Amino acid sequence: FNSTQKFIEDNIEYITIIAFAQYVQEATFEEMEKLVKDMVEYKDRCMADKTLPECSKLPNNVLQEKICAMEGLPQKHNFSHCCSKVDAQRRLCFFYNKKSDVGFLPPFPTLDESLLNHFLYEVARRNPFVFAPTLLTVAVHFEEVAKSCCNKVNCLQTRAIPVTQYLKAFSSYQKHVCGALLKFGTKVVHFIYIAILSQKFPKIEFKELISLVEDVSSNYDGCCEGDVVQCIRDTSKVMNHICSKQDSISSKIKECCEKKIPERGQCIINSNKDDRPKDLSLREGKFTDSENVCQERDADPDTFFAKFTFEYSRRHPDLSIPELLRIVQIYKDLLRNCCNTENPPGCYRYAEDKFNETTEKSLKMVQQECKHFQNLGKDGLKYHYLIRLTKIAPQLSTEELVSLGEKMVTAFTTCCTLSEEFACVDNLADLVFGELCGVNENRTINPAVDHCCKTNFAFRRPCFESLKADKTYVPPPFSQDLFTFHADMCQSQNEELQRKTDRFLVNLVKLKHELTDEELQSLFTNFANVVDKCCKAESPEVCFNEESPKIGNKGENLYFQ
């Protein structure tokens, strides 16, 4: 508690900036400095004589009251609805005020302890759900990278790509878990963390595991709401707990546990899975071999299924978290049928065959996907996913479809060569569909997608992969200029030329949504061939208009279907 209390008081400036910038993404840096002043005053007035009326209140309620008391702010950035509520309803309104879609903001500025203040402000408002320990550790990595630049501005933009990659990996997992908490409730977060921690810390004992999962679950309730102070406290408490029982949890965290807040926690999260105990059997037979499974379930169902997840997950370090959860659900459903029959021990005896069956099906699928990646390359496989994604979710904006497609192919670029490609691919690919379904909102894309988002956490990815083209789709008009090529397209440009190509393909699939995937891929390759040839020509402009495939159908020139 007391080291954590010191850390919070010493970093109150950074923490205040994170909270306000995440909650009110439109607020300016000058307004951040206003709230920093008022929060530093609050800190001092509490240290000097704690016994005050305002010192008793929770730090998120205090922060939100002072945001709500700023002259004109609620109405200026459209959050007066939240200030007109109080307490839990206000806190909930502020959580709902966050926008994952940060297109409305400009590009990220070029920096040349105000540097950290500015970095934190600019990162936090663009990543409104990322937890504070992650963000404060990202900034410490930015200070080191900044300082290793003696064109020192362009030195900083390069070299920050690994820092940015560290941020997005963490926030992608945090958003997936928070999204799951909103849509499915705390029970599912518990089962996610039973699987994760059991897999990562296989020598841990069940009772200590369940204790640790309760701590992590409470950490997520605070962090997902956006309560930065509580998130720092609850995260420290998780890491204190792990480091105090270190030799009974993991032999891989020695160096981590010697570090300070908040690097300690990030090291632990990043650490490798601990090795399986020598004496750990290949299978725990009591879930299938015993004749008393149904009564053990009936004595305490949630604890019984938690124990199953623990015992299965620590023995299967090569399954993804979604695959473990699918296995839990299959075991649960098998016992729901079996335990009301005349001979329950009979049908549940071979549950491991159902488990092996689904695992084999999933592994085959990933093998096939990685073979397509090897055959086609990154871009080739990206175009296949852009077509499929646009077919099933054509109501999404083209920018979002392109982002989702880029994230989907990066799962394969990261995972396919590695040992244990199956776990890596399936874990990363699950995050992509998580992004699709929303963090702090229930999104309305189309009925079939909405059904996959909301019905079942563990079976979400395979639900989506079984969807056919959205036959409900009525496209808006598209202007001809979306499909025209300009002379600027003919140079060795950055990956904003790749984003232009991706946008073209997505818009094309929207326009021509009734064509087959093969016909769309053929039409797209026709356009690419024409750009390859016309970019070698003198005057590419005229070449494109006299060699491009027709997309319209005569008497229809500015606006297509």
Ligand SMILES: *[C@@H]1O[C@H](CO)[C@@H](O[C@@H]2O[C@H](CO)[C@@H](O[C@@H]3O[C@H](CO)[C@@H](O)[C@H](O)[C@@H]3O)[C@H](O)[C@H]2NC(C)=O)[C@H](O)[C@H]1NC(C)=O
């Ligand atoms: C379900 O699938 C699993 C694996 O996907 C099957 O596990 C295999 O079971 C056999 C015998 O039960 C294991 O044999 C052992 O192999 C090790 C090799 O290091 C050897 O040292 C031991 O003495 C022993 O012979 C085998 O390891 C294991 N396979 C794997 C990959 O772990 C299991 O048979 C399937 N269960 C059902 C009910 O279908």
Ligand SMILES: *[C@@H]1O[C@H](CO)[C@@H](O[C@@H]2O[C@H](CO)[C@@H](O)[C@H](O)[C@H]2NC(C)=O)[C@H](O)[C@H]1NC(C)=O
């Ligand atoms: C988004 O969907 C979730 C999932 O149904 C909603 O959560 C439910 O909220 C009601 C009361 O409003 C509770 O009775 C349920 O227990 C909640 N379910 C779960 C699983 O937590 C949530 O209200 C929706 N949010 C919005 C803004 O529409």
Ligand SMILES: [Cl-]
């Ligand atoms: Cl975020």
Ligand SMILES: [Cl-]
């Ligand atoms: Cl920590």
